[PDB]
Amino acid sequence: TETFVKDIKPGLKNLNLIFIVLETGRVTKTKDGHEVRTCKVADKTGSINISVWDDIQPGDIIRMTKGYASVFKGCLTLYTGRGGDLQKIGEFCMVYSEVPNFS
Amino acid sequence: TETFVKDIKPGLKNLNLIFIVLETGRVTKTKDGHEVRTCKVADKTGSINISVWDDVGNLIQPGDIIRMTKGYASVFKGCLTLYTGRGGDLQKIGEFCMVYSEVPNF
Protein backbone atom coordinates (compact mmCIF):
# COMPACT_ATOMS: atom_id res chain seq x y z
CA THR A 1 0.00 0.00 0.00
CA GLU A 2 2.75 2.46 -1.01
CA THR A 3 2.47 5.66 -3.12
CA PHE A 4 4.58 8.25 -5.07
CA VAL A 5 5.85 11.82 -4.75
CA LYS A 6 4.13 14.21 -7.22
CA ASP A 7 0.79 12.48 -6.51
CA ILE A 8 0.69 13.97 -3.04
CA LYS A 9 -0.32 17.52 -2.12
CA PRO A 10 -1.33 19.11 1.20
CA GLY A 11 -3.80 17.09 3.22
CA LEU A 12 -3.62 13.38 2.57
CA LYS A 13 -2.77 11.92 5.93
CA ASN A 14 -1.98 8.29 6.28
CA LEU A 15 0.91 7.43 3.85
CA ASN A 16 3.48 4.49 3.70
CA LEU A 17 6.55 5.04 1.50
CA ILE A 18 10.12 4.15 0.48
CA PHE A 19 12.58 6.64 -0.87
CA ILE A 20 16.08 7.93 -0.99
CA VAL A 21 17.60 10.82 0.90
CA LEU A 22 19.07 13.57 -1.20
CA GLU A 23 19.91 16.42 1.17
CA THR A 24 19.51 17.43 4.88
CA GLY A 25 18.77 21.02 6.06
CA ARG A 26 19.62 23.18 9.10
CA VAL A 27 18.80 22.15 12.71
CA THR A 28 16.35 23.85 15.08
CA LYS A 29 16.36 22.86 18.74
CA THR A 30 12.95 23.82 20.12
CA LYS A 31 13.58 25.22 23.61
CA ASP A 32 11.59 22.32 25.05
CA GLY A 33 14.39 20.17 23.62
CA HIS A 34 13.51 18.35 20.39
CA GLU A 35 15.33 17.82 17.16
CA VAL A 36 13.02 19.14 14.46
CA ARG A 37 14.92 18.34 11.29
CA THR A 38 13.61 19.30 7.88
CA CYS A 39 15.01 17.36 4.94
CA LYS A 40 15.19 16.79 1.18
CA VAL A 41 14.17 13.36 -0.07
CA ALA A 42 12.19 11.88 -2.99
CA ASP A 43 11.46 9.06 -5.36
CA LYS A 44 12.35 9.36 -9.03
CA THR A 45 8.92 11.02 -9.49
CA GLY A 46 10.20 14.52 -8.72
CA SER A 47 11.14 15.99 -5.35
CA ILE A 48 9.82 16.95 -1.84
CA ASN A 49 10.86 17.99 1.69
CA ILE A 50 10.21 16.42 5.14
CA SER A 51 10.28 17.15 8.92
CA VAL A 52 11.78 14.93 11.53
CA TRP A 53 11.63 14.70 15.27
CA ASP A 54 14.80 13.54 17.02
CA ASP A 55 16.50 11.44 14.32
CA ILE A 56 18.93 10.01 8.62
CA GLN A 57 21.59 11.19 6.23
CA PRO A 58 21.65 11.47 2.47
CA GLY A 59 22.46 8.34 0.55
CA ASP A 60 19.95 6.45 2.60
CA ILE A 61 16.94 4.56 1.42
CA ILE A 62 14.07 5.19 3.80
CA ARG A 63 10.90 3.37 4.43
CA MET A 64 8.21 5.61 5.80
CA THR A 65 5.38 4.20 7.93
CA LYS A 66 2.13 6.00 8.84
CA GLY A 67 3.45 9.38 7.84
CA TYR A 68 1.27 12.11 6.48
CA ALA A 69 1.40 15.16 4.32
CA SER A 70 0.21 18.72 4.37
CA VAL A 71 1.93 21.92 3.54
CA PHE A 72 4.14 24.19 5.38
CA LYS A 73 3.17 26.73 2.95
CA GLY A 74 6.37 26.42 1.04
CA CYS A 75 5.14 23.34 -0.69
CA LEU A 76 3.53 20.51 1.22
CA THR A 77 5.61 18.59 3.74
CA LEU A 78 5.66 15.16 5.33
CA TYR A 79 5.11 14.30 8.96
CA THR A 80 5.29 11.20 11.03
CA GLY A 81 2.14 11.65 12.87
CA ARG A 82 -0.19 8.78 13.76
CA GLY A 83 2.80 7.44 15.50
CA GLY A 84 5.01 7.53 12.48
CA ASP A 85 7.97 5.30 11.80
CA LEU A 86 10.80 5.90 9.37
CA GLN A 87 13.08 2.97 8.73
CA LYS A 88 16.23 2.52 6.74
CA ILE A 89 16.31 -0.48 4.47
CA GLY A 90 19.39 0.07 2.35
CA GLU A 91 22.05 2.43 1.14
CA PHE A 92 22.95 4.11 -2.08
CA CYS A 93 25.98 6.03 -3.07
CA MET A 94 28.06 7.27 -5.97
CA VAL A 95 30.97 5.02 -6.94
CA TYR A 96 34.21 5.57 -8.84
CA SER A 97 36.34 2.82 -10.26
CA GLU A 98 39.66 3.13 -11.99
CA VAL A 99 42.57 0.94 -12.80
CA PRO A 100 45.43 1.37 -10.28
CA ASN A 101 48.59 3.13 -11.38
CA PHE A 102 51.51 1.04 -12.65
CA SER A 103 54.00 -0.47 -12.62
CA THR B 1 54.00 -21.88 -21.91
CA GLU B 2 53.90 -18.13 -21.03
CA THR B 3 55.71 -14.95 -22.25
CA PHE B 4 55.93 -11.35 -20.96
CA VAL B 5 54.66 -8.24 -22.68
CA LYS B 6 58.30 -7.18 -22.66
CA ASP B 7 59.48 -10.35 -24.39
CA ILE B 8 57.14 -9.91 -27.33
CA LYS B 9 58.11 -9.89 -31.03
CA PRO B 10 55.85 -9.21 -34.02
CA GLY B 11 55.13 -12.26 -35.98
CA LEU B 12 54.84 -14.47 -32.98
CA LYS B 13 52.43 -17.35 -32.41
CA ASN B 14 51.22 -19.47 -29.53
CA LEU B 15 50.43 -16.50 -27.30
CA ASN B 16 49.50 -17.56 -23.85
CA LEU B 17 49.64 -14.95 -21.16
CA ILE B 18 47.70 -12.86 -18.68
CA PHE B 19 47.40 -9.07 -18.52
CA ILE B 20 45.15 -6.26 -17.48
CA VAL B 21 43.11 -3.55 -19.24
CA LEU B 22 44.72 -0.16 -18.78
CA GLU B 23 42.48 1.93 -21.00
CA THR B 24 39.89 1.26 -23.68
CA GLY B 25 39.56 3.55 -26.68
CA ARG B 26 39.39 3.57 -30.47
CA VAL B 27 36.05 2.02 -31.31
CA THR B 28 35.82 0.89 -34.87
CA LYS B 29 32.76 -0.80 -36.33
CA THR B 30 32.11 -3.25 -39.18
CA LYS B 31 28.91 -3.18 -41.20
CA ASP B 32 28.28 -6.80 -40.26
CA GLY B 33 27.14 -4.68 -37.33
CA HIS B 34 29.94 -5.75 -35.00
CA GLU B 35 32.67 -3.58 -33.50
CA VAL B 36 36.38 -4.04 -32.84
CA ARG B 37 37.81 -2.63 -29.63
CA THR B 38 41.32 -1.29 -29.41
CA CYS B 39 42.57 -1.66 -25.88
CA LYS B 40 45.70 -1.07 -23.93
CA VAL B 41 46.75 -3.88 -21.72
CA ALA B 42 49.92 -4.75 -19.86
CA ASP B 43 51.84 -6.75 -17.45
CA LYS B 44 54.62 -6.19 -15.12
CA THR B 45 57.05 -6.07 -18.03
CA GLY B 46 55.36 -3.51 -19.96
CA SER B 47 52.31 -2.26 -21.82
CA ILE B 48 50.77 -3.07 -25.26
CA ASN B 49 47.69 -2.67 -27.49
CA ILE B 50 44.92 -5.05 -28.50
CA SER B 51 42.05 -5.14 -31.00
CA VAL B 52 39.04 -6.93 -29.57
CA TRP B 53 35.72 -8.23 -30.84
CA ASP B 54 32.66 -7.33 -28.73
CA ASP B 55 29.42 -5.80 -29.97
CA VAL B 56 28.70 -4.44 -26.49
CA GLY B 57 30.56 -1.42 -25.47
CA ASN B 58 30.47 -0.69 -21.92
CA LEU B 59 31.35 -3.97 -20.48
CA ILE B 60 34.99 -4.06 -21.10
CA GLN B 61 36.44 -2.11 -18.31
CA PRO B 62 39.70 -0.78 -16.95
CA GLY B 63 40.68 -3.18 -14.22
CA ASP B 64 39.64 -6.30 -16.10
CA ILE B 65 42.07 -9.17 -16.00
CA ILE B 66 42.15 -11.48 -18.95
CA ARG B 67 43.86 -14.73 -19.88
CA MET B 68 45.09 -14.66 -23.47
CA THR B 69 45.79 -17.98 -25.11
CA LYS B 70 47.26 -18.73 -28.48
CA GLY B 71 46.80 -15.25 -29.81
CA TYR B 72 49.07 -13.36 -32.20
CA ALA B 73 50.56 -10.03 -33.22
CA SER B 74 50.99 -7.68 -36.14
CA VAL B 75 51.48 -3.92 -36.31
CA PHE B 76 48.53 -1.83 -37.22
CA LYS B 77 48.76 1.76 -38.38
CA GLY B 78 52.30 1.80 -37.12
CA CYS B 79 51.23 0.68 -33.68
CA LEU B 80 51.62 -2.86 -32.48
CA THR B 81 48.23 -4.47 -32.00
CA LEU B 82 47.66 -7.92 -30.53
CA TYR B 83 45.13 -10.48 -31.76
CA THR B 84 43.79 -13.86 -30.63
CA GLY B 85 44.61 -16.97 -32.63
CA ARG B 86 42.10 -19.08 -34.49
CA GLY B 87 42.37 -21.73 -31.76
CA GLY B 88 43.17 -19.87 -28.62
CA ASP B 89 41.03 -17.62 -26.46
CA LEU B 90 40.55 -14.79 -24.02
CA GLN B 91 38.99 -15.25 -20.62
CA LYS B 92 38.29 -12.55 -18.06
CA ILE B 93 39.57 -13.99 -14.82
CA GLY B 94 39.37 -11.12 -12.36
CA GLU B 95 39.70 -7.42 -11.69
CA PHE B 96 41.73 -4.72 -9.99
CA CYS B 97 40.10 -1.35 -9.26
CA MET B 98 40.67 1.98 -7.59
CA VAL B 99 37.20 2.00 -6.09
CA TYR B 100 35.70 4.98 -4.35
CA SER B 101 32.23 5.55 -2.81
CA GLU B 102 30.34 8.70 -1.70
CA VAL B 103 27.02 10.51 -1.75
CA PRO B 104 26.86 13.76 -3.79
CA ASN B 105 25.35 17.19 -3.06
CA PHE B 106 22.85 19.58 -4.63
Side-chain angles (χ1 to χ4, degrees), chain A residues 82-99:
Chain A
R82 293 182 183 174
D85 197 32
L86 301 160
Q87 294 296 268
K88 169 188 185 187
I89 61 171
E91 252 277 325
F92 79 83
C93 64
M94 195 83 83
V95 183
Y96 299 80
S97 169
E98 305 178 4
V99 47

PDB file of all heavy atoms in Angstrom, chain A residues 82-99:
ATOM      1  N   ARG A  82       0.782   9.576  13.021  1.00  0.00           N
ATOM      2  CA  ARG A  82      -0.190   8.781  13.764  1.00  0.00           C
ATOM      3  C   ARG A  82       0.572   8.164  14.895  1.00  0.00           C
ATOM      4  O   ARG A  82       0.205   8.310  16.031  1.00  0.00           O
ATOM      5  CB  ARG A  82      -0.924   7.780  12.871  1.00  0.00           C
ATOM      6  CG  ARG A  82      -1.854   8.339  11.818  1.00  0.00           C
ATOM      7  CD  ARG A  82      -2.532   7.219  11.059  1.00  0.00           C
ATOM      8  NE  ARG A  82      -3.376   7.733   9.997  1.00  0.00           N
ATOM      9  CZ  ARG A  82      -3.998   6.982   9.107  1.00  0.00           C
ATOM     10  NH1 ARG A  82      -3.878   5.673   9.152  1.00  0.00           N
ATOM     11  NH2 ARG A  82      -4.736   7.543   8.169  1.00  0.00           N
ATOM     12  N   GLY A  83       1.715   7.602  14.578  1.00  0.00           N
ATOM     13  CA  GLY A  83       2.803   7.441  15.497  1.00  0.00           C
ATOM     14  C   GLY A  83       3.954   7.895  14.653  1.00  0.00           C
ATOM     15  O   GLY A  83       4.756   8.724  15.022  1.00  0.00           O
ATOM     16  N   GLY A  84       4.002   7.284  13.481  1.00  0.00           N
ATOM     17  CA  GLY A  84       5.015   7.527  12.485  1.00  0.00           C
ATOM     18  C   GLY A  84       6.189   6.617  12.721  1.00  0.00           C
ATOM     19  O   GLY A  84       6.530   6.318  13.860  1.00  0.00           O
ATOM     20  N   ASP A  85       6.800   6.144  11.646  1.00  0.00           N
ATOM     21  CA  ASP A  85       7.973   5.303  11.799  1.00  0.00           C
ATOM     22  C   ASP A  85       8.782   5.197  10.517  1.00  0.00           C
ATOM     23  O   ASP A  85       8.417   4.488   9.575  1.00  0.00           O
ATOM     24  CB  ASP A  85       7.577   3.909  12.275  1.00  0.00           C
ATOM     25  CG  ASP A  85       8.748   3.148  12.836  1.00  0.00           C
ATOM     26  OD1 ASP A  85       9.644   3.800  13.402  1.00  0.00           O
ATOM     27  OD2 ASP A  85       8.795   1.906  12.713  1.00  0.00           O
ATOM     28  N   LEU A  86       9.900   5.906  10.504  1.00  0.00           N
ATOM     29  CA  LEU A  86      10.797   5.902   9.371  1.00  0.00           C
ATOM     30  C   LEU A  86      11.904   4.907   9.573  1.00  0.00           C
ATOM     31  O   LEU A  86      12.619   4.973  10.565  1.00  0.00           O
ATOM     32  CB  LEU A  86      11.383   7.276   9.174  1.00  0.00           C
ATOM     33  CG  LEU A  86      10.293   8.304   8.957  1.00  0.00           C
ATOM     34  CD1 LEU A  86      10.821   9.686   9.255  1.00  0.00           C
ATOM     35  CD2 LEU A  86       9.826   8.217   7.545  1.00  0.00           C
ATOM     36  N   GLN A  87      12.052   3.988   8.632  1.00  0.00           N
ATOM     37  CA  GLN A  87      13.082   2.973   8.729  1.00  0.00           C
ATOM     38  C   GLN A  87      14.021   3.036   7.546  1.00  0.00           C
ATOM     39  O   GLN A  87      13.656   3.486   6.465  1.00  0.00           O
ATOM     40  CB  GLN A  87      12.451   1.591   8.838  1.00  0.00           C
ATOM     41  CG  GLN A  87      11.676   1.388  10.106  1.00  0.00           C
ATOM     42  CD  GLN A  87      12.559   1.457  11.335  1.00  0.00           C
ATOM     43  OE1 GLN A  87      13.071   0.445  11.801  1.00  0.00           O
ATOM     44  NE2 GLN A  87      12.737   2.650  11.868  1.00  0.00           N
ATOM     45  N   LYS A  88      15.241   2.591   7.782  1.00  0.00           N
ATOM     46  CA  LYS A  88      16.229   2.523   6.738  1.00  0.00           C
ATOM     47  C   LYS A  88      16.365   1.097   6.299  1.00  0.00           C
ATOM     48  O   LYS A  88      16.486   0.225   7.120  1.00  0.00           O
ATOM     49  CB  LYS A  88      17.564   3.054   7.224  1.00  0.00           C
ATOM     50  CG  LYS A  88      18.712   2.787   6.289  1.00  0.00           C
ATOM     51  CD  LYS A  88      20.008   3.184   6.962  1.00  0.00           C
ATOM     52  CE  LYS A  88      21.196   3.049   6.026  1.00  0.00           C
ATOM     53  NZ  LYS A  88      22.482   3.278   6.753  1.00  0.00           N
ATOM     54  N   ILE A  89      16.374   0.869   4.997  1.00  0.00           N
ATOM     55  CA  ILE A  89      16.309  -0.480   4.469  1.00  0.00           C
ATOM     56  C   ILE A  89      17.475  -0.783   3.540  1.00  0.00           C
ATOM     57  O   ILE A  89      17.722  -1.927   3.186  1.00  0.00           O
ATOM     58  CB  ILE A  89      15.008  -0.650   3.757  1.00  0.00           C
ATOM     59  CG1 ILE A  89      14.980   0.357   2.620  1.00  0.00           C
ATOM     60  CG2 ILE A  89      13.856  -0.330   4.685  1.00  0.00           C
ATOM     61  CD1 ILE A  89      13.847   0.181   1.683  1.00  0.00           C
ATOM     62  N   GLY A  90      18.204   0.254   3.154  1.00  0.00           N
ATOM     63  CA  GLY A  90      19.390   0.073   2.349  1.00  0.00           C
ATOM     64  C   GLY A  90      20.117   1.369   2.088  1.00  0.00           C
ATOM     65  O   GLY A  90      19.677   2.440   2.469  1.00  0.00           O
ATOM     66  N   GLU A  91      21.249   1.268   1.421  1.00  0.00           N
ATOM     67  CA  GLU A  91      22.046   2.435   1.140  1.00  0.00           C
ATOM     68  C   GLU A  91      22.049   2.730  -0.336  1.00  0.00           C
ATOM     69  O   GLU A  91      21.550   1.957  -1.131  1.00  0.00           O
ATOM     70  CB  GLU A  91      23.473   2.219   1.624  1.00  0.00           C
ATOM     71  CG  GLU A  91      23.843   3.026   2.845  1.00  0.00           C
ATOM     72  CD  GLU A  91      24.258   4.455   2.511  1.00  0.00           C
ATOM     73  OE1 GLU A  91      24.878   4.664   1.451  1.00  0.00           O
ATOM     74  OE2 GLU A  91      24.001   5.373   3.318  1.00  0.00           O
ATOM     75  N   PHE A  92      22.625   3.857  -0.703  1.00  0.00           N
ATOM     76  CA  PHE A  92      22.952   4.109  -2.085  1.00  0.00           C
ATOM     77  C   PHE A  92      23.997   5.153  -2.068  1.00  0.00           C
ATOM     78  O   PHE A  92      23.971   6.040  -1.215  1.00  0.00           O
ATOM     79  CB  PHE A  92      21.761   4.588  -2.897  1.00  0.00           C
ATOM     80  CG  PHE A  92      21.441   6.044  -2.704  1.00  0.00           C
ATOM     81  CD1 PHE A  92      22.117   7.037  -3.399  1.00  0.00           C
ATOM     82  CD2 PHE A  92      20.440   6.423  -1.841  1.00  0.00           C
ATOM     83  CE1 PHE A  92      21.816   8.382  -3.199  1.00  0.00           C
ATOM     84  CE2 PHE A  92      20.128   7.766  -1.650  1.00  0.00           C
ATOM     85  CZ  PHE A  92      20.812   8.744  -2.331  1.00  0.00           C
ATOM     86  N   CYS A  93      24.889   5.089  -3.040  1.00  0.00           N
ATOM     87  CA  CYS A  93      25.978   6.030  -3.066  1.00  0.00           C
ATOM     88  C   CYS A  93      26.563   6.093  -4.468  1.00  0.00           C
ATOM     89  O   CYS A  93      26.316   5.199  -5.295  1.00  0.00           O
ATOM     90  CB  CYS A  93      27.036   5.622  -2.052  1.00  0.00           C
ATOM     91  SG  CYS A  93      27.729   4.079  -2.514  1.00  0.00           S
ATOM     92  N   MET A  94      27.298   7.171  -4.740  1.00  0.00           N
ATOM     93  CA  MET A  94      28.059   7.274  -5.969  1.00  0.00           C
ATOM     94  C   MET A  94      29.389   6.560  -5.878  1.00  0.00           C
ATOM     95  O   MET A  94      30.058   6.636  -4.862  1.00  0.00           O
ATOM     96  CB  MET A  94      28.263   8.726  -6.368  1.00  0.00           C
ATOM     97  CG  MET A  94      28.717   8.778  -7.818  1.00  0.00           C
ATOM     98  SD  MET A  94      27.209   8.679  -9.045  1.00  0.00           S
ATOM     99  CE  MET A  94      26.684  10.541  -9.049  1.00  0.00           C
ATOM    100  N   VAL A  95      29.759   5.848  -6.945  1.00  0.00           N
ATOM    101  CA  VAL A  95      30.968   5.017  -6.938  1.00  0.00           C
ATOM    102  C   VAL A  95      31.922   5.248  -8.103  1.00  0.00           C
ATOM    103  O   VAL A  95      31.495   5.324  -9.238  1.00  0.00           O
ATOM    104  CB  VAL A  95      30.607   3.534  -6.944  1.00  0.00           C
ATOM    105  CG1 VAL A  95      31.867   2.680  -6.852  1.00  0.00           C
ATOM    106  CG2 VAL A  95      29.680   3.240  -5.804  1.00  0.00           C
ATOM    107  N   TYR A  96      33.218   5.315  -7.817  1.00  0.00           N
ATOM    108  CA  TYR A  96      34.213   5.572  -8.843  1.00  0.00           C
ATOM    109  C   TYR A  96      35.238   4.483  -8.906  1.00  0.00           C
ATOM    110  O   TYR A  96      35.898   4.186  -7.924  1.00  0.00           O
ATOM    111  CB  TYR A  96      34.895   6.895  -8.588  1.00  0.00           C
ATOM    112  CG  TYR A  96      33.925   8.024  -8.621  1.00  0.00           C
ATOM    113  CD1 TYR A  96      33.134   8.307  -7.537  1.00  0.00           C
ATOM    114  CD2 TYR A  96      33.772   8.783  -9.752  1.00  0.00           C
ATOM    115  CE1 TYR A  96      32.238   9.326  -7.574  1.00  0.00           C
ATOM    116  CE2 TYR A  96      32.878   9.810  -9.799  1.00  0.00           C
ATOM    117  CZ  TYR A  96      32.113  10.082  -8.707  1.00  0.00           C
ATOM    118  OH  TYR A  96      31.210  11.115  -8.745  1.00  0.00           O
ATOM    119  N   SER A  97      35.373   3.887 -10.078  1.00  0.00           N
ATOM    120  CA  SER A  97      36.340   2.823 -10.265  1.00  0.00           C
ATOM    121  C   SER A  97      37.338   3.145 -11.354  1.00  0.00           C
ATOM    122  O   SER A  97      36.991   3.632 -12.424  1.00  0.00           O
ATOM    123  CB  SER A  97      35.646   1.509 -10.589  1.00  0.00           C
ATOM    124  OG  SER A  97      36.594   0.552 -11.022  1.00  0.00           O
ATOM    125  N   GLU A  98      38.595   2.875 -11.053  1.00  0.00           N
ATOM    126  CA  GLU A  98      39.656   3.132 -11.988  1.00  0.00           C
ATOM    127  C   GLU A  98      40.711   2.090 -11.821  1.00  0.00           C
ATOM    128  O   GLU A  98      40.864   1.510 -10.755  1.00  0.00           O
ATOM    129  CB  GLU A  98      40.265   4.496 -11.757  1.00  0.00           C
ATOM    130  CG  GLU A  98      39.293   5.640 -11.782  1.00  0.00           C
ATOM    131  CD  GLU A  98      39.990   6.935 -11.503  1.00  0.00           C
ATOM    132  OE1 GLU A  98      41.228   6.909 -11.381  1.00  0.00           O
ATOM    133  OE2 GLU A  98      39.313   7.969 -11.370  1.00  0.00           O
ATOM    134  N   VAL A  99      41.464   1.865 -12.875  1.00  0.00           N
ATOM    135  CA  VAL A  99      42.567   0.936 -12.798  1.00  0.00           C
ATOM    136  C   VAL A  99      43.717   1.605 -12.085  1.00  0.00           C
ATOM    137  O   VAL A  99      44.080   2.727 -12.442  1.00  0.00           O
ATOM    138  CB  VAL A  99      43.000   0.495 -14.185  1.00  0.00           C
ATOM    139  CG1 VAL A  99      43.124   1.715 -15.088  1.00  0.00           C
ATOM    140  CG2 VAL A  99      44.304  -0.284 -14.121  1.00  0.00           C
TER     141      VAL A  99
END
